[PDB]
Design a protein around this ligand. Structure first.
Ligand SMILES: Nc1ncnc2c1ncn2[C@@H]1O[C@H](COP(=O)(O)OP(=O)(O)O)[C@@H](O)[C@H]1O
Ligand SMILES: [Mg+2]
Lengths: 296, 256
């Protein structure tokens, strides 16, 4: 509506556009997410219905704030607090330098606090990737883009098979488990943790089978001992090559022993044994954690 | 037992109090009654079966309907439009594959148009302020089921049936929170099938003693006894099926 001046287009989706915008009356800078109802003869997209209803219940320093919803006939606007940029842009800007170890630890600690809050509130994020994570100038990072999020039951049922961006997608999803849960979010953060440390995507698959093999080649091909039930999974094949697990000194060279220990628990194959966000926060890796300021 | 599980239960116990409809709202409705509401909910049970929707979707639609009718006066000729947009909205929230709007229009036999259903969806969203994630009797049941080792599937189908019957009659059941209805339905289902009683582990987790379930339990027991007589039959027909272990065909206990 008329009280926002559009500054620039900071994002795009098939759903609509995201603009940096300024409230003309108060001066407040916001991110403005436009969603097209008009090309919807189905009404309000379920993606928007979930994003809004779930964001309204999630109030936390490490989760982006939904300020307002403007629902007209032809359009739907979500108004969010504006943050300096997404973690992907930051990572690209840091590709040459590297992100200081104390900052990587701060960001992982914060992401884990936002995620533990989501899970305690029975929300799965399901799209944790660097471009959906937002940083400000004071050293904070927040979960964003809840468009794929879902409220889950205890215990879970079968939910949507197609979830999580390929590079960040957990093995139990690739192997077609009918049931998945909070562990898929922990897996994505594990991948993001490694990506911060090494300045490179950990498992940059160009297809589902390629994604799977990249994981196997690094963590070893899972068998019934490390992952009971795995050979019984719908997309598992006994003809998969058997690779041996690499040493983490090879995988994340810069990481100390505590860092390697945490990462490996976040990348555990068996979703049931994979570390929870709550437990991750209590890991020795975080005992010295500080909140340094990023360089932008 | 994941370590966020106790947190989720506590959270849902707080949300069910915030998402509760006004208990006496039907008195304030000039043109519609508890009986028209029962006909609507029963019809929504059949719509759920026709589209193979989850039970959760049905429980959410009823929550949305009761909250909407708590702040909005509705004539009897528009009650089904409210119920249809409620079901469409619960479908988009809950279902992997929500039926398209044209199908919802078809299931009312063109009683309403597409434009009307979409406009009613907008109004319902506005009135509920998009707070769609309500705790339901269903969510509390599934948590209570985890206290059966090993799982008893017949007890589970029976508890679900009793919980779904409660959706039909606003008087008495709007008087009880979903968690307490789920407690009585679980104990009643368990007593019927195994002759056993509400487990001490659930009494500690929920805070409900068997004693505190009693008022709701007396009501639920009566509803169970009189189910074959009730004017709305769609839930009994649904739970005759073998996937539900034909639990609606089980004889209720005579006394508790
Ligand atoms: N609050 C915000 N502050 C700054 N940039 C944002 C904000 N929200 C979104 N963006 C930018 O726009 C993007 C796309 O919006 P997002 O919420 O992820 O939805 P979608 O990916 O469905 O378009 C992000 O990648 C981010 O770079
Ligand atoms: Mg995004």
């Amino acid at each position: 509506m008329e009280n926002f001046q559009k500054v620039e287009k900071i994002g795009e989706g098939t759903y609509g556009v995201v603009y940096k915008a300024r409230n003309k009356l108060t001066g407040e800078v916001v991110a403005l997410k436009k969603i097209r109802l008009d090309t919807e003869t189905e009404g309000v997209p379920s993606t928007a219905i979930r994003e809004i209803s779930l964001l309204k219940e999630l109030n936390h320093p490490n989760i982006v704030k939904l300020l307002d919803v403007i629902h007209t006939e032809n359009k739907l606007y979500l108004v969010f607090e504006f943050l300096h940029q997404d973690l992907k842009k930051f990572m690209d800007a840091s590709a040459l330098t590297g992100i200081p170890l104390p900052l990587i630890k701060s960001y992982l600690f914060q992401l884990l606090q936002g995620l533990a809050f989501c899970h305690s509130h029975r929300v799965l994020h399901r799209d944790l990737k660097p471009q959906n994570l937002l940083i400000n100038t004071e050293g904070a990072i927040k979960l964003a883009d809840f468009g794929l999020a879902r409220a889950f039951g205890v215990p879970v049922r079968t939910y949507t098979h197609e979830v999580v961006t390929l590079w960040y997608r957990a093995p139990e999803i690739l192997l077609g488990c009918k049931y998945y849960s909070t562990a898929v979010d922990i897996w994505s953060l594990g991948c993001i943790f490694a990506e911060m440390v090494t300045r490179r995507a950990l498992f940059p698959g160009d297809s589902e089978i390629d994604q799977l093999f990249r994981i196997f080649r690094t963590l070893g091909t899972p068998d019934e001992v490390v992952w009971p039930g795995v050979t019984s999974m719908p997309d598992y094949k006994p003809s998969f090559p058997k690779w041996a697990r690499q040493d983490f000194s090879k995988v994340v060279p810069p990481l100390d022993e505590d860092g390697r220990s945490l990462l490996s628990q976040m990348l555990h194959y068996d979703p049931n044994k994979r570390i929870s966000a709550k437990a991750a926060l209590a890991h020795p890796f975080f005992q010295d954690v500080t909140k340094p300021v990023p360089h932008l | 037992v994941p370590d966020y599980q106790e947190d989720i239960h506590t959270y849902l116990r707080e949300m069910e109090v915030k998402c509760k409809p006004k208990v006496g709202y039907m008195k304030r409705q000039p043109d519609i009654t508890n009986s028209m509401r029962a006909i609507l909910v029963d019809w929504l049970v059949e719509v759920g079966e026709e589209y193979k929707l989850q039970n959760e979707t049905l429980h959410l639609a009823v929550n949305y309907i009761d909250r909407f009718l708590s702040s909005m006066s509705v004539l009897r000729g528009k009650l089904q439009l409210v119920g249809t947009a409620a079901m469409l909205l619960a479908s988009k929230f809950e279902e992997i594959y929500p039926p398209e709007v044209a199908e919802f229009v078809y299931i009312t036999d063109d009683t309403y148009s597409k434009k009307q259903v979409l406009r009613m969806e907008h109004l319902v969203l506005k009135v509920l302020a998009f707070d769609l994630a309500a705790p339901t009797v269903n969510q509390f049941l599934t948590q209570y089921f985890l206290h059966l080792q090993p799982a008893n599937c017949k007890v589970e189908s029976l508890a679900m049936f009793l919980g779904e019957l409660s959706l039909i009659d606003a008087d008495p059941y709007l008087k009880y929170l979903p968690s307490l209805i789920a407690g009585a339905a679980f104990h009643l289902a368990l007593y019927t099938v195994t002759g056993q009683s509400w487990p001490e582990s659930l009494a500690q987790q929920t805070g409900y003693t068997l004693e505190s379930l009693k008022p709701c339990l007396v009501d639920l027991h009566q509803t169970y006894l009189k189910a074959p007589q009730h004017a709305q039959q769609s839930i009994r027909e649904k739970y005759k099926h073998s996937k539900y272990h034909s639990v609606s065909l089980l004889n209720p206990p005579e006394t508790l």
